[PDB]
Hints:
This is part of a larger assembly, with 2 copies of chain A.
Chain A: H1 5-11, H2 23-39
PDB class: viral protein/immune system
Keywords: spike, Fab, antibody, covid, VIRAL PROTEIN-IMMUNE SYSTEM complex
Entry title: VFLIP Spike Trimer with GAR03
Amino acid sequence: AARDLICAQKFNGLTVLPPLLTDEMIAQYTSALLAGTICSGWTFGAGP
Amino acid sequence: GVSVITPGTNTSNQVAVLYQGVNCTEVPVAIHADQLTPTWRVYSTGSN
């Protein structure tokens, strides 16, 4: 099964580090950002 | 590249190892714990 070059990144020392913010956790952050847009507006970034 | 969480050596000597992209059932597959020294076994397999 393994022939393609994304296996050859693992063959030859190139490692992709996982992020500190995984895409579900960025979705948690941006869901708080969307709630901040829709019913606190623009005041959410200067404080609470 | 195994990411080893290491504190300050003036204060501590205990370590903990991140195995990147590795689930906990395949930790004895992703490193070869049957060949390892007995110091490495408590850091690689355990209740924590």
